[PDB]
Ligand binder design. Structure first.
Ligand code: HEM
Length: 395
């Protein structure tokens, strides 16, 4: 075995990718790395290779629960359906599959559309400058997931504080991480109790009824599933949208192109998903459960692999001019939502929020531009998903 290389190669800076990813793809080899916590791993950088570790059955995500799992976070996160194999993965995802399907999410489009109008109504009447993150991005994805899930949006003052700790690499000490995480699990348990004697017409109410009258999940499985859905809808989506807004505001000829032809929006959303490196470094580790050869390496049973999804999304053997934003690309087999068995449950929900938000924003503010130099936009530091912390704009 090679002497392991330090990983992360460095701090993730704005939306730039480290040069080592490009070199690794060309070499066609995995890199033995030593990560901030847990086992050593293999880093996987090519598209065809990230596809394999994400969904090949010889690579297990449940096996990582029985290990000191190779990770960037000080504490192992319970990842609900993202951390299990079949048959447990089937049984749990069955319980949420229909509400997140494309036809299911389409029934929310009038409400998201109505919400985006309310939010931009307010920008129009307040006048520039506006922090686009505070006045648009966080309300939108916050209110959409809170209404769908049942979580009180008015409770964001208390639970938004604990949300950060599930994403923290270096931003929080391990003790503060354990305190917030347990505070978050108590708060979800609060809401679940509320549904036992007052049922609700929302996703959380459906999940308690599936536990209480079908016994399809344990009580902790219910709480983990509720937490992951709130993390991904409140934080991961607002990070991608703010990042996508940064790209369009600093590459404004592409903004103007999307604005002048708003029917590109479905292609522009997929391309903004491919091009934006949302994942700061890597997604969740897999452990091989038998010997697997790939990237010049026989990965042995018991060994960890780390999929570098943003690097796969720049792979020159799948995407023409991969490092150039092409909002018109027609076929776009990106891995920004994962691949295969654990492909992102909220995929359609994110698409519809992004198409609607980008269309109205560009439409209602044809002269929209940043109100500060792109280099002085501040960025989240030491977190698992990249995002601007403020997006000052004018029009
Ligand atoms: C732009 C926003 C988002 C992005 C870029 C994104 C990305 C991803 C990726 C890359 C994976 C696969 C991870 C892996 O295999 O290591 C994943 C899985 C998942 N995502 Fe998201 N996601 C987003 C928003 C959401 C939303 C809004 C929800 C739900 C409300 C959600 C729920 C889930 C779940 C439950 C899984 C695990 C699915 C399974 O295990 O079958 N995500 N996501």
């Amino acid at each position: 075995t090679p002497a392991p290389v330090r990983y992360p190669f460095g701090e993730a800076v704005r939306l730039d990718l480290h040069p080592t990813y490009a070199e690794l793809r060309e070499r066609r080899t995995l890199l033995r790395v030593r990560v901030p916590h847990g086992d050593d791993a293999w880093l996987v950088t090519r598209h065809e290779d990230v596809r394999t570790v994400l969904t090949d059955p010889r690579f297990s995500r449940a096996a990582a629960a029985g290990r000191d799992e190779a990770r960037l976070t000080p504490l192992v996160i319970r990842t609900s359906v993202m951390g299990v194999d079949p048959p447990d993965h089937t049984r749990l995802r069955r319980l949420v599959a229909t509400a997140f399907s494309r036809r299911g999410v389409e029934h929310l489009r009038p409400g998201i559309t109505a919400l985006v109008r309310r939010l931009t109504d307010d920008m129009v009447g307040q006048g520039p400058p506006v922090d686009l993150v505070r006045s648009f991005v966080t309300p939108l994805s916050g209110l959409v997931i809170c209404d769908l899930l049942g979580v009180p949006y008015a409770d964001r003052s208390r639970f938004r504080h604990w949300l950060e700790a599930f994403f923290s690499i270096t931003a929080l000490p391990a003790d503060e991480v354990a305190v917030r995480i347990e505070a978050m699990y108590g708060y979800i348990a609060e809401l679940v109790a509320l549904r036992r004697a007052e049922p609700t017409e929302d996703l959380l109410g459906g999940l308690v009824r599936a536990r209480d009258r079908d016994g399809s999940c344990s009580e902790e499985e219910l709480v983990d599933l509720a937490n992951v859905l709130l993390l991904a809808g409140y934080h991961t989506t607002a990070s991608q949208l703010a990042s996508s807004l940064f790209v369009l505001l600093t590459q404004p000829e592409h903004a103007e192109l999307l604005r002048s032809r708003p029917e590109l929006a479905p292609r522009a959303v997929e391309e903004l998903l491919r091009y934006v490196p949302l994942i700061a470094h890597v997604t969740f580790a897999r452990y091989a459960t038998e010997d697997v050869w790939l990237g010049g390496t026989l990965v042995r049973a018991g060994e960890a692999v780390l999929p570098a999804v943003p690097s796969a999304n720049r792979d020159a053997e799948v995407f023409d001019e991969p490092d150039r934003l092409d909002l018109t690309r027609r076929h776009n087999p990106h891995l920004a939502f994962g691949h295969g068995l654990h492909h992102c449950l909220g995929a359609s929900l994110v698409r519809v929020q992004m198409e609607v938000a980008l269309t109205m924003l560009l439409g209602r503010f044809p002269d929209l531009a940043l109100a500060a130099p792109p280099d002085e936009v501040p960025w989240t530091r030491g977190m698992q998903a990249r995002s601007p912390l403020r997006l000052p704009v004018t029009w």
